[PDB]
Design a protein around this ligand. Structure first.
Ligand SMILES: *[C@@H]1O[C@H](CO[C@@H]2O[C@@H](C)[C@@H](O)[C@@H](O)[C@@H]2O)[C@@H](O[C@@H]2O[C@H](CO)[C@@H](O)[C@H](O)[C@H]2NC(C)=O)[C@H](O)[C@H]1NC(C)=O
Ligand SMILES: *[C@@H]1O[C@H](CO[C@@H]2O[C@@H](C)[C@@H](O)[C@@H](O)[C@@H]2O)[C@@H](O[C@@H]2O[C@H](CO)[C@@H](O)[C@H](O)[C@H]2NC(C)=O)[C@H](O)[C@H]1NC(C)=O
Ligand code: 1YL
Ligand code: 1YL
Ligand code: NAG
Lengths: 532, 537
């Protein structure tokens, strides 16, 4: 028996597993229960803390994926399958994982806490691309990741109701953060040095914890990769959340009053709610998800935009960034003329129809403004430019401009902010060349996946992954990603100078402006238009 | 008596003068009466044709400048005084001018008819910069210019009234064009080949004649320099014109103890005021402090213009028409010193962000806060939002694009798509003699002297290159007048037609023609396609 793999936490005893990496071993505790199973009468309810157990929990393998939609766009294709559930689905899914150096650290080690993305409707901490073994070995941090409920199970809301208050997936995440406060020291982690990091909806989640006082006391620093709590897809108002929940109930034959509606929903098999969840959206769109965090005054006391404007962010350091081509991946899910299997050289008519798919639920006047700004009026009908332009529309509106607005406001209100654009397209990418560096494709580099010999990355890619892991861990340790002067240095982003760095195989290059002209449109003008 | 200097026109006999030009002699008939003097009871009324006379009228010097405002921004300064009246002011001003080769052409010669600009409130055919002698000598065309009423006298309108129906200054121009049809042959001119040209409000006027069927039959080609009839300053609606006329009447005491009332009585009272008294108040009836807005301009009242120029252009079939159109490099700069905060010809006008924002409201007057925010969005560099030189240039672009470039671009694109052959230019040479500061670039009005061949005047101190440049331009303009195509009937760089898709235009400067694409296409998409939709909602 190996004592390094036996840990006692508040609820009881656990047995972990020793993992190999090319750099040496790591200890892992996978599938640690942190809540009571949120099922039966507990579906839609806030998570309850896991009650203490006798005996030893086997923490040697990932637990179930929270019940969710499974993508079917391209069955068996690596680029989509890599995001799909890779363990069995269950509502019994509130488990978390801890990776630590081997042997266990005996002094307090900085903690990275990963929150997966997936539009709040999908994702799992067990995905291969989130394997924490390389970051932990290389950079000697403790890494924690949790599953949280998604889709209707995590975000269905009848606002005001006790039976389905909404935001329970964010409470699962908060409960995991509390568990980290109470137990991470037993693994060698320092609960006073916790850095949250997340991508996409995971990044939106990180932002929401920043903006919610009861979460804010549970961590110290934040990293938001390709996502922000102020993204137009990341929250829904109370009225529309009620509308969607009510429609879902109808679609699944409920009722046979909030209490009655929820009671009926609780009788339905999980897969039945999943089968209808896309259909409660108000229109056909890309980058919109039915069940997302609701602004109801509780978890979020106001919209993230308002909270961001009102906040004093002295004492916060935050690392934020985007990939080179944020919009491209979403276009194959509904923009007319798009496919991963051709060049997607669309026509002007397709472009104009695509603007309403990618900028859903705005007035005709707003759409015309989008078309004005994203048309090259010297080449209004050129298909390659139209393809790139619609990618820009979707990527700017949903990711780049919300991230830029968060970055500028936080910096202006006291935070120290570092910004990047990730510009390396992986040698192993399975999506077509036209998509460039798509959403999600920096993650495997941050997690050091190229170091895995069984995969096919180049030697240059391994060095690049090592560089990125070092920036991320430097940031978690000190609030500053920089290595000692040599360089160039990564300067802080500020509302005026707007400096960020390119992350690519080449050394850091400093640039100015996160699509400043386009983001002035989305961040400054378009809301005034929508308001009048 | 010299037979070359004697001509009989329908009204009677004329005597003209022989003018010397650096290239040789020209015949000039200056100050030919073409209407009855529009004064006393004829003030505000359409022009009446000139009654025939016995004996010989001496057409031997320019007649009076139509009564108008006189600029006082920079007293004595060449750059402003060159546009000010250079003959006595009078309401008795409806005379035109004919220049013809000496000896008179023996076969019918193409005619150019010049219409001056000046915002419909100013201008005169007598200004030195419109001297027709060089063009006639160099290119052997006949040149005609006319005075037309301006300000209140030409454009005060009480729509529906017979006593001040509006647009009478446009009717003055039209009567002159009819005179050309009836009489130009007596001077050796070909009435079947008349090309109108004009700059600024004169260019807007040309376009209004294009769009008004009774004028359209009086000429065959058109040139629009730095102006268009669809310009936002160029026309006013019936209600706003009535409001302006009524407020002007009120400011000078008409009617006594009241506002508005019976139109006959209102106008009768206005007709008793001294001309200068109307002039002293004409700027005060505008709805706000602005630049590039003028109180009394053509009114869209269903008569001269049956619909807005914008709509007439969109609806028109322009097959059979050739047009030449263009802009100078810095259309906006000249207007800024007339009211944009922080601007002066006497410093660098390096304005602050706050002055830029205030200037946007002065330069894009009478739009919603939302429309103004859209302008600020499109004209701010969000990487350099407070940089004074960029702000100075951006406000110049705002004013020039909104008032001149984008209206010309829209007219050019619509006419081309609807049948016309169109040629477009940007004029990019700053005159060696220009007296405005360097920051203003090539300002509004500063191509005219080259088109008229003014650098060929010895008493002026233009360079030899500039004389050669002037000769080139006169050649393009007269080629266009003769053939509907400015290109030379070889190994010379060719000027391609402008079309809605390719949007090709040429750069006019000392260097040879360079072909470029797009008349500020991104900016003009904003002004022409989007901003109107915004204003409607
Ligand atoms: C590029 O492909 C899209 C998507 O099409 C699918 O994938 C192709 C590789 C091929 O297998 C097609 O038959 C598939 O339909 C094409 O857009 C579609 O066009 C078809 C008609 O040809 C229409 O029935 C679908 O509804 C369209 N789908 C969408 C999402 O618009 C597009 O035409 C292709 N571009 C080309 C060929 O230039
Ligand atoms: C640039 O000049 C403008 C215009 O001012 C006039 O011209 C100057 C050259 C000088 O002769 C001034 O005395 C003239 O008033 C300046 O704008 C003005 O500022 C004064 C007070 O400083 C104010 O009373 C006027 O209203 C302003 N005029 C405007 C706003 O049109 C401007 O400040 C000058 N820029 C400098 C000096 O950097
Ligand atoms: C089934 C369905 C309907 C409408 C939109 C969908 C979408 C996805 C998957 C299934 C969808 C989908 C994305 C979308 O933007 C999207 O709109 C990406 C987040 C990848 O999976
Ligand atoms: C007296 C007065 C008030 C308001 C605006 C005026 C303006 C000019 C002259 C006098 C003005 C004036 C121009 C304007 O744009 C302008 O707004 C240019 C056309 C040159 O003369
Ligand atoms: C206006 O007053 C004059 C003054 O006599 C009169 O002749 C005219 O008919 C009046 N018109 C109207 C419409 O009242």
């Amino acid at each position: 028996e190996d004592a390094e793999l036996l840990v006692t936490v508040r609820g009881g005893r656990l047995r972990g597993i020793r993992l190999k990496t090319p750099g040496g071993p790591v200890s892992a505790f996978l599938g640690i229960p942190f809540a009571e199973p949120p099922m039966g009468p507990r579906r839609f309810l806030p998570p309850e803390p896991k009650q203490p157990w006798s005996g030893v929990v086997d923490a040697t393998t990932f637990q179930s994926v929270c019940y969710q939609y499974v993508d079917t766009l391209y069955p068996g294709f690596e680029g989509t399958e890599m995001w799909n559930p890779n363990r069995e689905l269950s509502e019994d899914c509130l488990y978390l994982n801890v990776w630590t150096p081997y042997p266990r650290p005996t002094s307090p080690t900085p903690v990275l806490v990963w929150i997966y993305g997936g539009g709040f409707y999908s994702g799992a901490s067990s995905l291969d691309v989130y394997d924490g073994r390389f970051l932990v070995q290389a950079e000697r941090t403790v890494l924690v990741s949790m599953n949280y409920r998604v889709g209707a199970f995590g975000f269905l809301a009848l606002p005001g109701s006790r039976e389905a208050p909404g935001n329970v997936g964010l409470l699962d995440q908060r409960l995991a953060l509390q568990w980290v406060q109470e137990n991470v020291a037993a693994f060698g982690g320092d609960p006073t040095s916790v850095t949250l990091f997340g991508e996409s909806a995971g990044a939106a989640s990180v932002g929401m914890h920043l903006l919610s006082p009861p979460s804010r006391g549970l961590f110290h620093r934040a990293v938001l990769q390709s996502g922000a709590p102020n993204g137009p897809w990341a929250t829904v108002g109370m009225g529309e959340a009620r509308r969607r929940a009510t429609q879902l109930a109808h679609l699944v034959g409920c009722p046979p009053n909030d209490t009655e509606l929820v009671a009926c929903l609780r009788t339905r098999p999980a897969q039945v709610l999943v089968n209808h969840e896309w259909h409660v959206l108000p229109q056909e769109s890309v980058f919109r998800f039915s069940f997302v965090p609701v602004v109801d005054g509780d978890f979020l006391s106001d919209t993230p935009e308002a909270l961001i404007n009102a906040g004093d962010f002295h004492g916060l350091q935050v690392l934020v960034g985007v990939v080179k081509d944020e919009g491209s991946y979403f276009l194959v899910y509904g923009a007319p003329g798009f496919s991963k299997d051709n060049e997607s050289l669309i026509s002007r008519a397709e472009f104009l129809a695509g603007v309403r798919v990618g900028v859903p639920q705005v007035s005709d006047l707003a759409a015309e403004a989008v078309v004005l700004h994203y048309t090259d009026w010297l080449h209004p009908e050129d298909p390659a430019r139209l393809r790139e332009a619609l990618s820009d529309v979707v990527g700017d509106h949903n990711v780049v401009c919300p991230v830029a607005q968060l970055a500028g406001r936080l910096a202006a209100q006291g935070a120290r902010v570092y910004a990047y654009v990730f510009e390396h397209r992986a040698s192993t990418l399975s999506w077509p060349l036209w998509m460039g560096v798509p959403h999600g494709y920096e993650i495997e580099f941050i997690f050091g996946i190229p170091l895995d010999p069984s995969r096919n990355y180049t030697a240059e890619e391994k060095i690049f992954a090592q560089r990125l892991m070092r920036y991320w861990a430097n940031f978690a340790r000190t609030g500053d990603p920089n290595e000692p002067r040599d360089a160039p240095q990564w300067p802080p982003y500020t509302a005026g100078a707007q400096q960020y760095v390119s992350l690519d195989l080449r050394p850091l290059e400093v640039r100015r402006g996160l699509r400043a002209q386009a983001c002035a449109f989305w961040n400054r003008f378009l809301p005034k238009l929508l308001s009048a």
